[PDB]
Design a protein around this ligand. Structure first.
Ligand SMILES: CC(=O)SCCNC(=O)CCNC(=O)[C@H](O)C(C)(C)COP(=O)(O)OP(=O)(O)OC[C@H]1O[C@@H](n2cnc3c(N)ncnc32)[C@H](O)[C@@H]1OP(=O)(O)O
Ligand SMILES: [Zn+2]
Lengths: 272, 27
């Protein structure tokens, strides 16, 4: 019954049960190494570990870097221990996360922010190496201390950048958590309105939008419906560009320039 | 390559491949 964790300089309340070994669980308090994600039972043991631990960032390859923001690609097979610890840590904040131990079939995309002591964990998403259903995200998490600052949408944007470069369309693995659904709705909205703002033509197929954005046709239609931009006039379906939504976006996109909370495709260095 | 949706009380079936017209809020 873990209530709290000490993670670097933060003290975080947990949301859900995670299956940590019982003799850790019963303390109700875990001390975590912020770099290798090893869990320990006291401050003093943590302090001892930090003196020995060489890790200043996630394992795997740094495939994105824009200044202090990185994304590391970590192979569940090559770095089993790290990926399990990450999954156990994630399940403290995920209601729905199934698995924690069998991480070999998964890639983990771990987003970090650098300061003078190292590259600190912001969040991550996991991805099946080979998904039967072409899911481009399995679970996604922003660490609580970083929530609602724009990092989540950057992680989501990053998941779709990978899909674009793979020349696939993608979708998050069902089921979507409540906060998952909200974040994805905000992102889908943003990219759909951006597309329609830039697009000059007289008509588009859902297919064409999906091809550009890597977003799944169903998710596009779902968003069009959400914004009440699908209509039916004289026996055919029309995309209705709402002026309120247009004006709202250019306003929201005027503050997106000075935000710095943006994934920049030119800062990716990756091949599947 | 279809989808089902309810728009203002009606129920509709929409193709993914068919181009749909873009309107700029007219009658
Ligand atoms: C397939 C799956 O993995 S589904 C599981 C998803 N993961 C989880 O539920 C685990 C816990 N949740 C999280 O870690 C986070 O909520 C995430 C990853 C879903 C989103 O991360 P964040 O860093 O908070 O996202 P970001 O800062 O980019 O904000 C995302 C959008 O969601 C909204 N949002 C985020 N949290 C909340 C909240 N508690 N209440 C209302 N809105 C919220 C933001 O307002 C924004 O939308 P807007 O621009 O339309 O207002
Ligand atoms: Zn360590």
């Amino acid at each position: 019954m873990i209530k709290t964790i000490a993670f670097g300089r933060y003290e975080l309340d947990t949301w859900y049960h995670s299956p940590y070994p019982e003799e850790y669980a019963r303390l109700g308090r875990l001390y975590m190494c912020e770099f290798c994600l090893k869990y320990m039972k006291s401050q003093t043991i943590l302090r001892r570990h930090m003196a020995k631990c060489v890790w200043k960032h996630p394992p795997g390859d740094e495939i994105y870097r824009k200044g202090s923001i990185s994304v590391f690609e970590v192979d569940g097979k090559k770095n089993k221990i790290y990926c399990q610890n990450l999954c156990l840590l994630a399940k403290l904040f995920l209601d729905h996360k199934t698995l924690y131990y069998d991480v070999e079939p998964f890639l983990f995309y771990v987003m970090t922010e650098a300061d003078n002591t190292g590259c600190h964990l912001i969040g991550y998403f996991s991805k099946e190496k080979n998904s039967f259903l072409n899911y481009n995200v399995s679970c996604i998490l922003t660490m609580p201390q970083y929530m609602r600052q724009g990092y989540g949408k950057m992680l989501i944007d990053f998941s779709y950048l990978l899909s674009k470069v793979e020349e696939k369309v993608g979708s998050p693995e069902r089921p979507l958590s409540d906060l998952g659904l909200i974040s994805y709705r905000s992102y889908w909205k943003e990219v759909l309105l951006r597309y329609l703002h830039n697009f000059q033509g007289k008509e588009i197929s859902i297919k064409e939008i999906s091809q550009e954005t890597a977003v799944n046709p169903v998710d596009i239609v779902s968003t069009l419906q959400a914004l009440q931009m699908l209509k039916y006039w004289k026996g055919k379906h029309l995309v209705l560009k709402r002026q309120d939504l247009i004006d709202e976006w250019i306003a929201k996109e005027a503050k997106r320039s000075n935000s710095n909370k943006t994934m920049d495709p030119s800062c990716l260095k990756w091949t599947p | 390559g279809m989808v089902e949706i309810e728009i203002e009380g009606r129920l509709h079936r929409i193709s993914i491949f068919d181009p749909l017209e873009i309107i700029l809020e007219d009658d």
